[PDB]
Symmetry: D3
Subunit: 175 residues, 6 copies
């Protein structure tokens, strides 16, 4: 029972996808779905006193250029628990490379929080909030000798194209 | 692996049942067991700044008039995590309709918290605490245009009859 | 010393005011400044499982129609501690009556959280969030038999005029 | 100003007293009012992984056999912040000796939490909860080599007589 | 899907084992893996206001003298969620009997928290921290009439011998 | 009264100093004592999702090259509340420049937490923890366009000399 393989990418792809959350906002512990058992695993404790600024996880049945499930960041007011599924509306995409392939990350809002009803595109997000997320990813591995370049942000349409591409990559890899 | 179908309704039905908790007390996020995978899912974020006043979930292998597993509310001092099983003693039952069928909810205490040892019936609960729970359910969907009528509270015996009825409903539906 | 009397209403009244916080967002306990002494006092525990949706306090050296210091609600991502001073930009005002008294409340954002840099008027707030604040005040005293009437929301300009009026009422009262 | 000296012992002594809280329920840090100044001070960190089971503080303008202000324990569902004033109804008293000193402690409920409306005497408290409070004081200083003797619990009447006695000791000491 | 049987004892036994956490540090609720379904279950609420001083759980595919999976205590700065796997370096072992067979417990640190990089043996732990853990286990069931004798602490080498013995016990019992 | 002016620098200067805490570990809100009044004020919300890695405050009756009270960082397992006094043993000093000003900060442990009994100098601190504190100050104002230079860490002896120097600067400034 590995929810990464068992759940479909979403109920109305790519307008609404499922986000399987691994890390709640506010966590300094970096969790991930164990590849084998699908249990939650501690990947590492961040080397710096930083916390995930968003609920962070993966879209089920996706694969990406970086050889991982496609990352998704969901803006939740109250963080969820790890392994919670959220119906999420993609509104943009963070463009970054940590190495050699794209490690881009979808930015999304919960469909079922009315607070975010008018958040439909990247332009709807407060600039300082985008800058805080980009900064987190730019620096959170700095003490691990890792450097990352944030290229910028793409819009909702680009996010949705990339989601479809990641769904196709998963089908091509696993069938 | 869906714990709703896999776990028995309880170790000594209906004097002690299992409560599979979906929502810890204090949550504004309304979680539920995903029908298909049995993973935790965000159903919605409550539209108002209210929090679940009890640990809330379902009794495994039950079905009810409203076409859902039978709801159970467990009074915990320290909330549990979602998907935690609690051995629970039914002490009463909240009578309400949100629509057209009974959406009644068992009120229970943890067998293994000695704080609640003398809580055996509805009359053992502070009146204001019952009124706070009823009020939560009366108003928590008010901004979703939903109206609910709380009829009142039934006693431990009535709660136990309803649990047995819900166990029979599940057997009749699924076998 | 009593901070309600010792602090000025703000550093750039009424464009920027001091909010002296009594109740952090997420509190079910209703604290209030004892103007006998400067000390935080538990006014009551809310009768329902509701939490303050905003950091809630008073503007120093103000008074109001309801015989209290003028209320201010500050939108904070991370709640502050009681008795914390926040430099706040008024962006609107909630118009409500409590138990027959005009009991309006300023809505404001923290000047020094860049997240809110572009919140400058009431139209900048998500409608669902305004609705949730109003609903809270509509229902939080319902089990206490008290009645509130929410009239609606005024804009930043009206909030600022009310601030000036409340500043004069303090002079009228104590001066 | 020093709130231990500036506040009265209560608004309706000894039926209702002020509890000036030093330690919120759930704290492992042992705070205490610095009666040099009014300020909260870290007295120590408990040597064991135990937490205060009650909101713990002092009654203003009291003194006691052990050379401290008279201790009061308030049963709060949601803990208050340190230095919060609570209007408290004494319902009993814990009789204990600390390091050879009479060090009894009032047990009280908040007047303004309707949850506790019918708690008026020591027989209203769950026995397991009384046991847990006593056990905490029995063992919390064990790694510090200190010995405590818990004698038992007295009723509301005895608590109130002790409150009056402690009020007179303050006059004897400072008056 | 029972993670106790499904996961291997560790990636580099016995230098690095997997710790499947049942109870996060700070919990008063005592959780355990349900024997049958492998869901988290509330075993009991501790009878005293004590909290687990470490993240507590089991090593997968182990069995011990006491007829349970072998216990492991992991020192985490930020507690994990129940059912999280942690790669853990054994540094010592708490020797205790609660009854008649050894109920010894491995003490470990997370490999992937650099804070603990130089914690490799029992001598690396602050004495007061060992004393706090031993005290917790000595007293936490005191109100349940249970008495426990803490014998002392063994070193990293002894911990590793015992882990290997527990791995062999599991193979002998289940195959 | 203003605790920065009313409290002495410590009970056994400079071996033991008072730390007046402004910011609890784990805070993203940057609080500071308003030396206009004694009151806690929100200075800003950090622009990045970082949290203070230490309990952060000032030493009473000190002043410094940067025109502020001398900064002190206290390593607390459980964070204290703002405005809490902690008796602290200096063990080292972080040497850094903020915006062109010498802005060094004492590192200290609480005298009354036995966990830290053997932390008496800078070599007693895990290197990763020193690195995480420095990194925090290296990057926490990066989105604010401010530059900091971390020089390194000095030992307990140097910290204590700096404390004496800062005590004299307060006399120079106010005396
Ligand atoms: Mn990726
Ligand atoms: Mn139902
Ligand atoms: Mn008002
Ligand atoms: Mn005493
Ligand atoms: Mn064992
Ligand atoms: Mn400085």
């Amino acid at each position: 029972m590995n929810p990464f393989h068992e759940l479909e990418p979403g109920p109305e792809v790519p307008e609404v996808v499922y986000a399987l959350i691994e890390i709640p906002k506010g966590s300094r512990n970096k969790y991930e779905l164990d590849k084998k058992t699908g249990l939650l695993k501690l990947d590492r404790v961040l080397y710096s006193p930083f916390f995930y600024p968003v609920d962070y996880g993966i879209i089920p049945q996706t694969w990406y250029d970086d050889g991982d499930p496609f990352d998704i960041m969901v803006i939740m007011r109250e963080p969820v628990y790890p392994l919670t599924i959220i119906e999420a509306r993609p509104i943009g995409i963070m463009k970054m490379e940590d190495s050699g392939d794209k490690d881009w990350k979808v930015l999304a809002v919960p469909v079922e929080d009315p607070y975010f009803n008018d958040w439909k595109d990247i332009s709807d997000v407060p600039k300082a909030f985008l800058d805080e997320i980009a900064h987190f990813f730019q620096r959170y591995k700095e003490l691990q000798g890792k450097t990352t370049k944030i290229e910028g942000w793409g819009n909702a349409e680009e996010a949705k194209r990339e989601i479809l591409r990641a769904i196709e990559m998963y089908k091509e890899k696993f069938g």
